[PDB]
Design a protein around this ligand. Structure first.
Ligand SMILES: [Mg+2]
Ligand SMILES: [Mg+2]
Length: 95
RNA sequence: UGGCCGGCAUGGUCCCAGCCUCCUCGCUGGCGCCGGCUGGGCAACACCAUUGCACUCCGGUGGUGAAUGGGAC
């Protein structure tokens, strides 16, 4: 059951050996070109490691980001991207 | 020594270089041998497990079972 378009993209299959601060920075380095990014959430907990949430201001950016970077080698691993299931709080606090 | 004890061995104080380490990374730390008890913490590092949809920080285990020489008095 695929997911519907969202302001936020959910990425997984990320190298778990990368520290949080660096991961967010590197992610911003490659995704900022698709549009303004409101935030990038990363957690190294047992349940949230290897994944990240990049929150774009406009859905078209998320959609572009998703199509353009699907499978992109990042820290030696093919990035897997999908739309997030539900809106991030930062987005709800508006739209 | 992260805290603590037992056995044995061992002239001294320095000075230069090199090396070691999860627990006060460096020159007013340490760098003989053997044995046993034990605390903290996953922050760093490593290993194991994890492919996971969050917006509440939060899986486990291991390391000292470490490290040489030279010179001056
Ligand atoms: Mg020590
Ligand atoms: Mg950990």
């Amino acid at each position: 059951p695929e997911t519907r378009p969202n302001h936020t993209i959910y990425i997984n299959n990320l190298n778990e050996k990368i520290k949080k601060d660096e991961l967010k920075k590197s992610l911003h380095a490659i995704f900022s070109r698709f549009g303004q990014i409101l935030d990038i959430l990363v957690s190294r907990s047992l349940k949230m490691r290897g994944q990240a949430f990049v929150i774009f201001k406009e859905v078209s950016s998320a959609t572009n980001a998703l199509r353009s970077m699907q499978g992109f080698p990042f820290y030696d691993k093919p990035m897997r991207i999908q739309y997030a299931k539900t809106d991030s709080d930062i987005i709800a606090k508006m739209k």
